[PDB]
Subunit: 333 residues, 3 copies
Amino acid sequence: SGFYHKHFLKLLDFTPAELNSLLQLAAKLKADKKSGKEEAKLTGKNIALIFEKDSTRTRCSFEVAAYDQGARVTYLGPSGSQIGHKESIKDTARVLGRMYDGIQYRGYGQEIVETLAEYASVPVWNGLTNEFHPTQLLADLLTMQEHLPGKAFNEMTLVYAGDARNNMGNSMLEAAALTGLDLRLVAPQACWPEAALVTECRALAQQNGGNITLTEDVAKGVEGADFIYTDVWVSMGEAKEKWAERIALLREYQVNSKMMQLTGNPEVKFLHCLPAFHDDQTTLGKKMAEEFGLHGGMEVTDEVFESAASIVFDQAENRMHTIKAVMVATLSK
Amino acid sequence: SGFYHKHFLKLLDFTPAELNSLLQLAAKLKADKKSGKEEAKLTGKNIALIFEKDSTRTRCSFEVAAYDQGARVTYLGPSGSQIGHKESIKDTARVLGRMYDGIQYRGYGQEIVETLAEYASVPVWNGLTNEFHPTQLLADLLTMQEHLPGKAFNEMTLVYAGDARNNMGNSMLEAAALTGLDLRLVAPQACWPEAALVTECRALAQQNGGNITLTEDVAKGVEGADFIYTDVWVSMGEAKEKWAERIALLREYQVNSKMMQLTGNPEVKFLHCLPAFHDDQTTLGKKMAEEFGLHGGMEVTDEVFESAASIVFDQAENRMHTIKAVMVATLSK
Amino acid sequence: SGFYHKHFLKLLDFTPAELNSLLQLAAKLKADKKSGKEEAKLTGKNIALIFEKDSTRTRCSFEVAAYDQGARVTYLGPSGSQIGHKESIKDTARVLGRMYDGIQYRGYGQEIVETLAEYASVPVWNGLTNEFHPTQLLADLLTMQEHLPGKAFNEMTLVYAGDARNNMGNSMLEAAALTGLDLRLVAPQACWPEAALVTECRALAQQNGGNITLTEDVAKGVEGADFIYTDVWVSMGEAKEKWAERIALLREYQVNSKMMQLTGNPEVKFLHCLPAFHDDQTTLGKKMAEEFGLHGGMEVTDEVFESAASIVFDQAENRMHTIKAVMVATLSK
Ligand SMILES: N[C@@H](CCCN[P@@](N)(=O)NS(=O)(=O)O)C(=O)O
Ligand SMILES: N[C@@H](CCCN[P@@](N)(=O)NS(=O)(=O)O)C(=O)O
Ligand SMILES: N[C@@H](CCCN[P@@](N)(=O)NS(=O)(=O)O)C(=O)O
């Protein structure tokens, strides 16, 4: 179909060729900004940014991408608007679609963003839901490509360790499906994503020359990895009781120097969508470090996080370039 | 001019003539935007948006309107600044007035917005107070004209059912005073607006060929109505302790299909300033529904809300074009 | 020397000459805006505004200053982002430095803004920390220059009364160190600023033709004052419990007409960084009045605050012109 006037709710709504085009557009916009040759395509466009959860990267990416492109934005945060508590999403979508050219939504159930897209009458982009986080994967893939230039995604081995059933796990399944990556989801069975989704995506991944492996075996799982990726063990919005349960299950899947060693690959790089709990320099991070005896980092150690192998800030930067591409592609021709 | 640097705090501060001019400006600005011939008149202008209460429509109307007109905005929400608690309104006014070209204020007592207007030295616009919501009526009036083209306001019958002593009830009175509408406030005597304002506003409406009827009788009260309007029974900022007494006094005044049929006009349309509790798709909407046994809708039924007679979203869109007229008229020329 | 691509974290990181240049740029920018001859130098720049505390003057100064100069801003308030609770400052700094051209930070410990500066890779400006509030002094100095034309700072006597160990007391010390002001901190001993800073700053102030006097004696400290300055007795972030002890200790240092009279100078002017508790018009201002028997105001009486001698709003206005100078001086040649 293409991107013009299309929503961006999850990756599987696009073809491998579409995903690839988006990535090339992101790379091009990245270079034009860096060279002072950026051509504003969204001048005069007004964009609404709905956030029902906290955000630094996604919030800032949409803001900077919009401003660079000549657009203006309205940030509607977790509090201060009628959204959710006093007004239905169907109503919110119908009001915003009459005033804005595009709408970003970060929140809970994927069904909320789906309903918004159905009733907005303008492009709606998923800035993170409980089930999927498509723009993140766009940033991740562009980063991997830049770090293994002249290496097709189907020549790459990517390991995602930890909670494989959160939005990132699901998104990992989608990206392999459209790229042919050799995806390894290294986690305990209790944190494995939906079998039906794994089946669908593995078939598609193989079709593109890759595979999808779900294993509890760290050694076998990370062998030959080009990239090890992780994320917090309890996501935004989950009840705090999930920490005890999750840490008991996932502490052995922490990304630390031993795991980096187990890949047998001196060039392996480390990725993390962020925010990360890698030291005691955050309120909640210090809380959990003491409550669960995790000193030196949780899902990843500060050692790996700050090591030469870590490319999380290149990854974070790309969040803005890929989000700019999504808005340019869906709002201009 | 005539509007130049004039505050917009309530409708009785204007004449029928001024009202028509703003409505005409709004209509022109609406067509210019849609046709793409919008000429920015507020380039370089900086506007402060003080919000002591939640907002989706008003917040977005001021932002989009300002952006379309080349102005910039600073959103000062319920949290984050010194307003209310740490600093007097008088002080806040004199500070903002030294930095901004205009100030929108949404909050509590009308005296706050009057004090702000007193000391700001720049135009102040009321984006809702406990007593009045003038920008909403501009949108409503424009919407009605568009839906009964060619008809003058004294040729239209408008019914407002429910809590007639909230900000909307007072603003309906004001609107009738300046248009000569045949206004019917259908509500229990306990929710009737202040007699003094009714009397003042009735004399003026009649001068304009209209009238103001306050009746507890629904059947006779809605006969011949061109429009049926309603709003939530407990307004933002009112003690939650008021819901029981309100629901009991007002549930009989719910805008449902029986009320619509009672007008005897097949062309009757439904208006609601929004947000509306018309189903179980909102947090407090679902809670109050099950708490008082009101499913399928509260002040309005989902059935009427979603019917072909409902024009609430044309009405919501008009919030932006009319707020734009207000800023353009008072800041420009 | 210069400001180009330098941080602005505290005054002592600059020379008397650099400060003077900044103040002159502020006066120019102020005059240019007023004459409608302002030339935007930050067109296309994107700035992140981190606020961990509330703000009206600083928030709006940064927004208006940026808009006037063609830059855009992303307000990251006390809630809605990952800052501090979910993500460390090093991480935040490295993420924002990849997307923005400049970062403003208002919060707590000075070490937070220093780390931010160390890791951002872009200029970061201190919009207030527990220890320093440099942009405020720029506004104060410009207002003093403007109100005592053709009198060098070292020909002026400045009195700061009250809690002299908060960010404002420390900043007064720095300001006197760079200008040669005859500064008097009229405050009880328990509230005198740290010894080492007093010593370092007095030598520099003297080098510049001024002095720094700490005294518990009001009459002696305010004699011959050209300006009397004060601030709230309990600062943002400090425990509410401090009010009890602070009022008992500082009540004697309230700025009232008697203190103005004790200067022996008919032309003495009054300054206050704001917010100010000078009447009951505040939430936590009405109470503390009745609760602690403080009538007429707290750190300052309403009589003094509203008197002809008060120039607090010229001072507040200058917060914007000086913050504009800071961003222009650091982001452009
Ligand atoms: N599983 C996590 C994923 C967080 C992604 N956060 P990210 N890279 O989009 N930055 S943020 O600053 O915009 O939050 C969760 O749901 O909590
Ligand atoms: N009586 C109600 C009126 C709400 C008007 N809300 P409205 N049309 O201005 N949209 S909002 O999204 O900006 O709140 C009350 O005071 O709660
Ligand atoms: N010592 C005080 C100083 C407050 C400065 N506040 P100011 N002139 O920057 N306005 S504000 O509206 O931006 O807060 C304290 O730390 O609480």
